[PDB]
Design an enzyme around this catalytic site. Structure first.
Site, PDB file in Angstrom:
ATOM      1  N   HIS A 211       0.847  -1.214   0.000  1.00 34.54           N
ATOM      2  CA  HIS A 211       0.000   0.000   0.000  1.00 34.54           C
ATOM      3  C   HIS A 211       0.877   1.256   0.000  1.00 34.54           C
ATOM      4  O   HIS A 211       0.353   2.348  -0.244  1.00 34.54           O
ATOM      5  CB  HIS A 211      -0.987  -0.090   1.174  1.00 34.54           C
ATOM      6  CG  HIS A 211      -0.422   0.135   2.542  1.00 34.54           C
ATOM      7  ND1 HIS A 211      -0.114  -0.925   3.413  1.00 34.54           N
ATOM      8  CD2 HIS A 211      -0.189   1.267   3.234  1.00 34.54           C
ATOM      9  CE1 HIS A 211       0.329  -0.447   4.561  1.00 34.54           C
ATOM     10  NE2 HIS A 211       0.323   0.894   4.475  1.00 34.54           N
TER      11      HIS A 211
ATOM     12  N   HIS B  57       7.070   7.887   6.554  1.00 31.93           N
ATOM     13  CA  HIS B  57       6.488   7.445   5.263  1.00 31.93           C
ATOM     14  C   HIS B  57       5.652   8.585   4.677  1.00 31.93           C
ATOM     15  O   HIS B  57       5.566   9.664   5.314  1.00 31.93           O
ATOM     16  CB  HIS B  57       5.633   6.189   5.485  1.00 31.93           C
ATOM     17  CG  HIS B  57       4.485   6.468   6.425  1.00 31.93           C
ATOM     18  ND1 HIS B  57       4.482   6.003   7.717  1.00 31.93           N
ATOM     19  CD2 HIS B  57       3.309   7.161   6.284  1.00 31.93           C
ATOM     20  CE1 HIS B  57       3.361   6.378   8.319  1.00 31.93           C
ATOM     21  NE2 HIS B  57       2.691   7.180   7.505  1.00 31.93           N
TER      22      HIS B  57
ATOM     23  N   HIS C 103       2.036   9.759   2.225  1.00 31.88           N
ATOM     24  CA  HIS C 103       0.785   9.446   1.499  1.00 31.88           C
ATOM     25  C   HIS C 103       0.685  10.330   0.267  1.00 31.88           C
ATOM     26  O   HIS C 103       1.166  11.482   0.281  1.00 31.88           O
ATOM     27  CB  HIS C 103      -0.460   9.654   2.365  1.00 31.88           C
ATOM     28  CG  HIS C 103      -0.482   8.888   3.640  1.00 31.88           C
ATOM     29  ND1 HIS C 103      -1.167   7.698   3.784  1.00 31.88           N
ATOM     30  CD2 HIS C 103       0.257   8.989   4.774  1.00 31.88           C
ATOM     31  CE1 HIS C 103      -0.973   7.218   5.002  1.00 31.88           C
ATOM     32  NE2 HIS C 103      -0.125   7.977   5.625  1.00 31.88           N
TER      33      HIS C 103
ATOM     34  N   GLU D 122      -3.559  13.808   3.426  1.00 34.84           N
ATOM     35  CA  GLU D 122      -4.552  13.207   4.338  1.00 34.84           C
ATOM     36  C   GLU D 122      -5.235  14.341   5.067  1.00 34.84           C
ATOM     37  O   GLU D 122      -6.458  14.553   4.861  1.00 34.84           O
ATOM     38  CB  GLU D 122      -3.875  12.186   5.243  1.00 34.84           C
ATOM     39  CG  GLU D 122      -3.526  10.942   4.472  1.00 34.84           C
ATOM     40  CD  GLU D 122      -3.484   9.649   5.258  1.00 34.84           C
ATOM     41  OE1 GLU D 122      -4.137   8.713   4.824  1.00 34.84           O
ATOM     42  OE2 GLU D 122      -2.718   9.574   6.264  1.00 34.84           O
TER      43      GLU D 122
ATOM     44  N   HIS E  52       4.554  11.826   7.072  1.00 37.91           N
ATOM     45  CA  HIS E  52       4.317  11.392   8.474  1.00 37.91           C
ATOM     46  C   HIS E  52       5.644  10.939   9.115  1.00 37.91           C
ATOM     47  O   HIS E  52       6.228   9.951   8.626  1.00 37.91           O
ATOM     48  CB  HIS E  52       3.302  10.251   8.520  1.00 37.91           C
ATOM     49  CG  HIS E  52       1.956  10.750   8.156  1.00 37.91           C
ATOM     50  ND1 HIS E  52       0.880   9.888   7.804  1.00 37.91           N
ATOM     51  CD2 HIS E  52       1.494  12.028   8.124  1.00 37.91           C
ATOM     52  CE1 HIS E  52      -0.178  10.674   7.555  1.00 37.91           C
ATOM     53  NE2 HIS E  52       0.122  11.967   7.789  1.00 37.91           N
TER      54      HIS E  52
ATOM     55  N   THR F 278      -4.176   6.562  10.490  1.00 38.55           N
ATOM     56  CA  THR F 278      -5.015   6.903   9.303  1.00 38.55           C
ATOM     57  C   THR F 278      -5.336   5.673   8.445  1.00 38.55           C
ATOM     58  O   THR F 278      -6.011   5.825   7.407  1.00 38.55           O
ATOM     59  CB  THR F 278      -4.378   7.980   8.417  1.00 38.55           C
ATOM     60  OG1 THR F 278      -3.159   7.499   7.860  1.00 38.55           O
ATOM     61  CG2 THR F 278      -4.145   9.276   9.180  1.00 38.55           C
TER      62      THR F 278
HETATM   63  C1  LIG Z   1       0.140  -1.321  14.267  1.00 41.41           C
HETATM   64  C2  LIG Z   1       0.694  -1.668  13.102  1.00 41.41           C
HETATM   65  C3  LIG Z   1       2.175  -1.799  12.919  1.00 41.41           C
HETATM   66  N1  LIG Z   1       2.687  -1.506  11.559  1.00 41.41           N
HETATM   67  C4  LIG Z   1       3.731  -2.427  11.107  1.00 41.41           C
HETATM   68  C5  LIG Z   1       5.013  -1.840  11.687  1.00 41.41           C
HETATM   69  C6  LIG Z   1       4.805  -0.349  11.641  1.00 41.41           C
HETATM   70  C7  LIG Z   1       3.295  -0.166  11.407  1.00 41.41           C
HETATM   71  C8  LIG Z   1       2.943   0.346   9.995  1.00 41.41           C
HETATM   72  N2  LIG Z   1       2.495   1.735  10.006  1.00 41.41           N
HETATM   73  C9  LIG Z   1       1.436   2.120  10.719  1.00 41.41           C
HETATM   74  O1  LIG Z   1       0.553   1.325  11.046  1.00 41.41           O
HETATM   75  C10 LIG Z   1       1.454   3.522  11.244  1.00 41.41           C
HETATM   76  C11 LIG Z   1       0.813   4.561  10.565  1.00 41.41           C
HETATM   77  C12 LIG Z   1       0.758   5.836  11.104  1.00 41.41           C
HETATM   78  S1  LIG Z   1      -0.118   7.179  10.345  1.00 41.41           S
HETATM   79  N3  LIG Z   1      -0.278   6.948   8.783  1.00 41.41           N
HETATM   80  O2  LIG Z   1       0.753   8.331  10.467  1.00 41.41           O
HETATM   81  O3  LIG Z   1      -1.415   7.212  11.040  1.00 41.41           O
HETATM   82  C13 LIG Z   1       1.331   6.117  12.335  1.00 41.41           C
HETATM   83  C14 LIG Z   1       1.999   5.105  12.999  1.00 41.41           C
HETATM   84  O4  LIG Z   1       2.633   5.226  14.205  1.00 41.41           O
HETATM   85  C15 LIG Z   1       2.674   6.511  14.824  1.00 41.41           C
HETATM   86  C16 LIG Z   1       2.052   3.817  12.449  1.00 41.41           C
HETATM   87  O5  LIG Z   1       2.651   2.796  13.115  1.00 41.41           O
HETATM   88  C17 LIG Z   1       1.966   2.371  14.296  1.00 41.41           C
HETATM   89 ZN   LIG Z   2       0.752   7.950   7.543  1.00 42.02          ZN
END
Ligand SMILES: C=CCN1CCC[C@H]1CNC(=O)c1cc(S(N)(=O)=O)cc(OC)c1OC
Ligand SMILES: [Zn+2]
Length: 256
Positions: free
Chosen positions: A60, A90, A92, A102, A115, A195
């Site tokens: 994704h 990362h 978006h 976003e 982010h 998100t």
């Molecule tokens: C809980 C899921 C664990 N995943 C696999 C390892 C990192 C993570 C992948 N990225 C995200 O899920 C992730 C995404 C965001 S976001 N797009 O900024 O809401 C933030 C985050 O941690 C502040 C994230 O990690 C917890």
């Molecule tokens: Zn993000």
């Protein structure tokens, strides 16, 4: 879950009912409704380029992960009492330059969003423990405005040729992602969520007032990443932005 119509944002609530929760992200920041908060301290980032670890194609999106075994790379100040440990950044983006961000500001959609993700190492002992806690996570979001090529993105864009397809991962070393943030760290903050699934209501959001640039061709490099595994038919990673979610009474505070 994905960003397809069949597995996308409008469907996530079937497997993750929190998608319709009171603290969902992202949001539209309405500047006439933000409350200046005198107690908000300046944002303090201090990141060690030796904590950069790897870049990974997760189907994704792509993630740049950091060694998070200690407090070499930390966020402090703003609304926080606790130190937050850097673990990832990362992006978006959207199908078109017209959308991709976003968060939106007074309804305006930017072309992409950065982010920079952190977890509360003062209170918790691992990302996995922190991820579901109201105070577990912190994200600096930066709106990306289409215009001039951004030379600070170069090391990142150069790396994508090694992780073209889903599951590909490569080392990614000696990088300080504070180099990507805008010169002003004036910010909005609100209580919010991941998100994308699992959409935990665990994120203190920090949204920069100042945008950073990105060229239409730099965005094309992100969309040229492939969501399929090596050997299968090419499925470009065209978009991965969630629509904005209702405030449901939350207050967006402004540092400025
Ligand atoms: C809980 C899921 C664990 N995943 C696999 C390892 C990192 C993570 C992948 N990225 C995200 O899920 C992730 C995404 C965001 S976001 N797009 O900024 O809401 C933030 C985050 O941690 C502040 C994230 O990690 C917890
Ligand atoms: Zn993000």
């Amino acid at each position: 879950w994905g960003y397809d119509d069949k597995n996308g944002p409008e469907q996530w609530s079937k497997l993750y009912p929190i998608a319709n929760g009171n603290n969902q992200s992202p949001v539209d920041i309405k500047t006439s409704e933000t409350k200046h908060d005198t107690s908000l301290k300046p944002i303090s980032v201090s990141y060690n380029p030796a904590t950069a670890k790897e870049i990974i194609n997760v189907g994704h999106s792509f993630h740049v992960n950091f060694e998070d075994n200690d407090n070499r790379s930390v966020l402090k100040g703003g609304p926080f009492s606790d130190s937050y440990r850097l673990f990832q950044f990362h992006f978006h983006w959207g199908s078109t330059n017209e959308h991709g961000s976003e968060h939106t500001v007074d309804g305006v959609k930017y072309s992409a969003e950065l982010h920079v993700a952190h977890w509360n190492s003062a209170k918790y002992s691992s990302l996995a423990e922190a991820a579901s806690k109201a105070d577990g996570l912190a994200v600096i979001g930066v709106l990306m405005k289409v215009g001039e090529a951004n030379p600070k993105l170069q090391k990142v864009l150069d790396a994508l040729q090694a992780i073209k397809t889903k599951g590909k991962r490569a080392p990614f070393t000696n990088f300080d992602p504070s180099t990507l943030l805008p010169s002003s760290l004036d910010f909005w903050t609100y209580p919010g969520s991941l998100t994308h699934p699992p959409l935990y209501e665990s994120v203190t959001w920090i949204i920069c007032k100042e945008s950073i640039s990105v060229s239409s061709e730099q965005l094309a490099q992100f969309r040229s990443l492939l969501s399929n595994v090596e050997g299968d038919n090419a499925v470009p990673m065209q978009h991965n932005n969630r629509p904005t979610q209702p405030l449901k009474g939350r207050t967006v505070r402004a540092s400025f």
